Design a protein around this ligand. Structure first.
Ligand code: M4T
Length: 161
């Protein structure tokens, strides 16, 4: 079903995350972490304090697809075990965000072609710089397009809100 998913997404904020390679998204899927440039880290930390759920929607560049989406479970923090990101220097990254995956399945851009993002000139939601915020209605509908991920139990993430 989609009811718990809709509950998690209610009044959420959404951010497009663009990765240059599949290895970084695989690492994020395995370890439940993300790291980004400070301009976006600051935006994500502000959003985390401001909304019940902050959703990151991942897309590997040139892949033609989104690779899933996850919910921020923490503000960024420094001093953890170093994540061996494959970058485009590691000091240039900000802190690390803990994330809880909501869907690890892919969605091709062909399926989201009817969704435009008001915060990026109503261009199709697939188009945007890393860190681009997606307006609430567009972001909710995009997340609802993903195939259900039956390996994830959202009871756990609901208890964090
Ligand atoms: C994990 C990751 O790929 N972070 C990143 C790299 C380059 C630019 N912005 C963010």
């Amino acid at each position: 079903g989609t009811s718990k998913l809709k509950y998690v997404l209610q009044d959420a904020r959404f951010f497009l995350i663009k990765s240059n390679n599949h290895e970084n998204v695989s690492l994020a899927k395995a370890k439940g972490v993300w790291s980004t440039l400070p301009v976006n880290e600051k935006k994500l930390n502000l959003a985390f304090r401001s909304a019940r759920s902050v959703i990151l929607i991942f897309s590997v560049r040139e892949s033609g697809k989104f690779q899933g989406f996850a919910r921020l479970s923490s503000e960024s923090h420094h001093g953890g075990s170093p994540i061996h990101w494959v970058l485009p220097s590691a000091k240039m990254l900000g802190g690390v965000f803990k994330i809880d995956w909501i869907c690890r399945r892919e969605l091709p851009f062909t399926k989201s072609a009817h969704l435009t993002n008001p915060w990026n000139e109503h261009k199709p939601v697939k188009i945007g710089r890393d860190g681009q915020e997606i307006e609430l209605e567009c972001g909710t509908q995009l997340c609802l397009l993903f195939p259900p991920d039956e390996s994830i139990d959202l009871y756990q993430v609901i208890h964090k809100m």
